């Protein structure tokens, strides 16, 4: 048993790889097309769902850069936005790179508001997307909403300076919320599954109880978010929880458990997940794939975004 082999459990699980597919196509576009594209994608999104107001604690980390941009001319603002899209080496792009996804999202949500308000340079009124950009946008509109918001988030996260090239830095993230009181936790129920570790995983995460959640993992275990590489080691996993996994609502529905190598157990769970950005307005179709050692500790868990609601019944 290795992490590489663990990634392969439950191979008939059909992930929504249309997301990385579309991201690849989007990445072929010019910075100018990218900004215009996302503006139109953002407006399209607004036809059905509204972004929740970012937390004040989150925005205080973006406030400095936002203030600087707001005081710029339209031409200067557009250049900064192009710099972010191009991953150009600039002070703003380097600052951006140290931010967690939620801070990056709150930052762009504010710029979007200011674009609507006339405070930040808008997309040119009669701007024409390239043929390829148009086609990418058409494909976006054809995907379910869970896949749509995942594409937009991924693109936001990938802007700015290459974080890897910053070497060591203080990571900027939202402050920790106190875990929910036990009496206030709404425990999950999973049809076909009684596994204590899986239930503890779901309930602790829903409670923002990361200190108890991390105890479920083995030292050298790993967690794999949708479409990215596994995050290895309890230290990295806990940091991921604290920085990116606050105020989620996991609503698992069904699951199955099977024997695995070396006395391990593998467990597949399907259900829905809500992000605090949209709440109940977007229930993403998810699968969890656990690999548990004989002591019931988590060696590996993959979290998949599924290709369609039909996959929820694929056990």
Ligand X SMILES: CC1=C(/C=C/C(C)=C/C=C/C(C)=C/C=C/C=C(C)/C=C/C=C(C)/C=C/C2=C(C)C(=O)CCC2(C)C)C(C)(C)CCC1=O
Binding site for ligand X (CB under 6 A): 35, 38-39, 42, 51, 105, 108-109, 111-112, 115, 149-150, 152-153, 156, 205, 225, 244-245, 248, 250, 273, 275, 277, 284, 286, 303
Q: Report, in Å, the least distance between residue 244 CB and ligand X.
A: 6
Q: Report, in Å, the least distance between residue 192 CB and ligand X.
A: 18
Closer residue to ligand X (CB): 53 or 261: 53
Closer residue to ligand X (CB): 222 or 250: 250
Dig out the tokens for 56 from the structure.
């004040």
Closer residue to ligand X (CB): 42 or 172: 42
Q: Report, in Å, the least distance between residue 201 CB and ligand X.
A: 7
| Sheet containing 249-259: order of strands | 231-232, 217-224, 298-305, 284-292, 265-274, 249-259
Closer residue to ligand X (CB): 105 or 222: 105
d(CA 7, CA 169): 30
Tell me the residue number closest to ligand X, measured at CB: 112
Q: What are phi and psi of 119, to 5 degrees?
A: -90, -20
Q: Report, in Å, the least distance between residue 167 CB and ligand X.
A: 26
Closer residue to ligand X (CB): 38 or 183: 38
Q: Report, in Å, the least distance between residue 138 CB and ligand X.
A: 18
Residue written as tokens 């494909």? 139
Q: Report, in Å, the least distance between residue 245 CB and ligand X.
A: 4
Is the Cβ–Cβ distance between 214 and 238 less than 8 Å?
yes
Closer residue to ligand X (CB): 289 or 293: 289
């Amino acid at each position: 048993i290795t992490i590489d082999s663990a990634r392969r459990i439950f191979p008939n699980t059909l992930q929504a790889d249309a997301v990385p597919a579309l991201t690849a196509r989007f990445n072929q576009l010019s910075a100018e097309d990218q900004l215009a594209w996302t503006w139109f994608a953002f407006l399209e999104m607004g036809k059905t769902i509204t972004v929740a107001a970012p937390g004040a604690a989150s925005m205080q980390f973006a406030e400095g850069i936002l203030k600087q941009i707001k005081e710029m001319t339209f031409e200067e603002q557009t250049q900064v936005m192009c710099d972010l899209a191009n991953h150009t080496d600039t002070p703003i792009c380097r600052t951006y790179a140290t931010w967690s996804p939620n801070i990056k999202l709150g930052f762009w949500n504010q710029l979007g508001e200011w674009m609507e308000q006339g405070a930040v340079a808008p997309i040119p009124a009669g701007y024409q997307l390239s043929a390829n950009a148009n086609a990418v946008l058409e494909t976006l509109k054809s995907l379910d909403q869970g896949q749509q918001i995942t594409v937009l988030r991924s693109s936001v996260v990938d802007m700015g300076f290459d974080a890897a090239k910053l070497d060591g830095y203080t990571r900027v993230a939202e402050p920790l919320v106190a875990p929910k009181d036990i009496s206030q936790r709404v425990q999950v129920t999973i049809e076909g599954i009684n596994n204590s570790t899986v239930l503890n995983y779901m309930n602790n995460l829903n409670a923002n109880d990361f200190d108890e959640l991390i105890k479920l993992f083995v030292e050298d275990g790993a967690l794999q978010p949708p479409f990215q590489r596994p995050i290895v080691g309890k230290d990295a996993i806990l940091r991921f929880f604290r920085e990116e996994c606050q105020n989620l609502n996991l609503l698992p529905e069904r699951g199955v458990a099977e024997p695995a190598d070396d006395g391990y157990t593998q467990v597949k769970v399907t259900g829905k997940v809500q992000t605090p950005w949209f709440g109940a307005a977007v229930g993403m179709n998810m699968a969890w794939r656990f690999l548990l050692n004989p002591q019931g500790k988590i060696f590996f868990v993959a979290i998949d975004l599924l290709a369609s609601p039909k996959e929820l019944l694929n056990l």
